[PDB]
Amino acid sequence: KRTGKPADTPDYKQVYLPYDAAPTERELERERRRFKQAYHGRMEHRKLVEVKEVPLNVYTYGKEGMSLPIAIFKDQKDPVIGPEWTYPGIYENKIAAQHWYTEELFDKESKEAFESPWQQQILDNQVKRRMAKVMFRMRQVNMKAVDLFQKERGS
């Protein structure tokens, strides 16, 4: 849908520099060449895919001193990204929040080895989403027969 989307694309403003030591173009190359491929899916389906639009500078990209063009009010100054440890449970999320197939978490809970305590909570909310999916159709099937995949698909 076209509604609720930005009609203009403001730019990045770099306020202060995260490092005091400027990098060589050969460092900026070896880092950017590291990010051009990345993994998708976590399981026996694991696919190396190519990442479009990799920023020129890796060191200077998201990590600090950059102002985001998310500003909203008139007097709102573009928020300047602060240091890593200043953001709560960020290192924790670097472990916790990623793509988890349910199987993968289940066997972690049964082996009693969790990467993070949050993966507990991650698991339960997953299970709930699945049986939610169950509870919905059971409410729909209640009112009329809804037959799965009997209709012709596409055109």
Partner 1 sequence: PKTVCVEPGSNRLPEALVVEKARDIFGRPEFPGKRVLHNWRFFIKAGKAATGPPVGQEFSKLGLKAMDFAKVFNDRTKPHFKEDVELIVRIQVYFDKSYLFTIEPPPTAWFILRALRKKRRETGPVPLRGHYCALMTLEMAYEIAKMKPLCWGRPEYPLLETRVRRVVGQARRMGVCFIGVDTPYSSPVKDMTEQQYTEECERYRRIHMEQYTTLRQRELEEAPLIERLHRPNMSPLTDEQIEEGLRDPCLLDTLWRASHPLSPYHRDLRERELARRYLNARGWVKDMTPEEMRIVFMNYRLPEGEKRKQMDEAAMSGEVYWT
Partner 2 sequence: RYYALPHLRTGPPMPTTLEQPSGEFPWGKFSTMVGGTRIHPLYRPDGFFKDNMYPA
Partner 3 sequence: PQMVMSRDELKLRCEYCRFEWIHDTLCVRCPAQPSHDQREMWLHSTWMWGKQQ
Residues that bind partner 3 (CB under 8 A): 143-145, 147
Structure tokens, 137: 């159709």
Please, which residue, 72 or 143, has the CB nearer to partner 3?
Answer: 143
Q: Which stretch binds partner 2 (CB under 8 A): 2-10, 52-60, 81-89, 133-141?
A: 133-141
Q: Least Å distance between CB 46 and partner 1?
A: 12
Residue 147 binding partner per list partner 2, partner 1, partner 3, none, with a CB distance cut-off of 5 to 8 Å that depends on partner kind: partner 3
Residue 112 binding partner per list partner 3, partner 1, partner 2, none, with a CB distance cut-off of 5 to 8 Å that depends on partner kind: none
Among 124, 59, 114, smallest CA distance to 92 is for 114
34-56: b or e for each residue (b if 16 or more CB lie within 10 Å)?
A: eeeeeeeeeeeeeeeeeeeebee
Contact 11, 69 (CB under 8 A): yes
Q: Which stretch binds partner 2 (CB under 8 A): 1-9, 32-40, 132-140, 143-151?
A: 132-140
Q: What is the widest separation between alpha-carbon atoms in the chain?
A: 68
